[PDB]
Structure formats: C-alpha cells, structure tokens
Amino acid sequence: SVSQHFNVYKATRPYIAYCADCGAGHSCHSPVAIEAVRSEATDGMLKIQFSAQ
Amino acid sequence: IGIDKSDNHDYTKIRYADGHAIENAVRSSLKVATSGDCFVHGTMGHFILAKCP
C-alpha cells in the first residue's frame, strides 16, 4: 500500500529554517519555510517544497 | 477595541455602540480587509493597524 511509498520518510524529520516573512514582515525561524517553487507544468501547477512533512 | 462594556481593559472585547447603551462584541470577529485580507497588526481604542494588499 501507500505505506511502502512512505518507507523512506522513517529516517527523516521536519526542520526549522529562516523565512524572512510570516505575514507580518519579520524574521521567523518558522517550522514551515518555503525552499523552492517549481512551476514546470505547462498547465500550471506549483510544487511548493517547504520544511515540513 | 480593547475595552469591555463595563469600562475595563480587555484584549478580547470591542465596545460597539448599539441603540442607547454600549454592548460587547467578540474581538476575534475583526476582518479589516481590502480586496485581499489585511493582517491586523494590533489594535487599541479607535484605531486598527493593517497591512492590506
């Protein structure tokens, strides 16, 4: 099942990283932090990658 | 915003006039919003602070 797909994440963890914004223009060190928007579909469908699982 | 109907400081009350007597409205129902949705940065008395788009 999908558990097989998630067999990789057993040795991973979310991390805290700088953000530079939290909806209030302030340094965060937030648990959620965007790292790279990866728009590559001609249809248009972002692949936001962020520091949480 | 910040004072209950009984003239006491309270960060979850909004003295909103009604008829002839003061009333008390829940503060969490404040939706200062232009076309977008302003992130209210803090309020006191008659003055709200916003960062509208």
Among residues B46, B40, B41, the alpha carbon closest in space to that of B14 is found at: B46
Contact B41 A23 (CB under 8 A): no
State whether residue B6 is helix, strand or coil.
Answer: coil
Give the C-alpha separation, B53 to B36, whole Å. Answer: 6
Q: Other CB atoms closer than 10 Å to residue A50's CB: what's the count?
A: 16
B26 has which bridge partners? B13
Technique used by the depositors: cryo-EM
DSSP B27-50: GGG----SSS-----EEETTEEE-
Resolution of the experimental model in angstroms, please?
3.7
Q: B40 to chain A: nearest residue by CA?
A: A24
Distance from CA of B36 to the nearest CA of A (A): 13
Return the structure tokens found at A13.
Answer: 């963890």
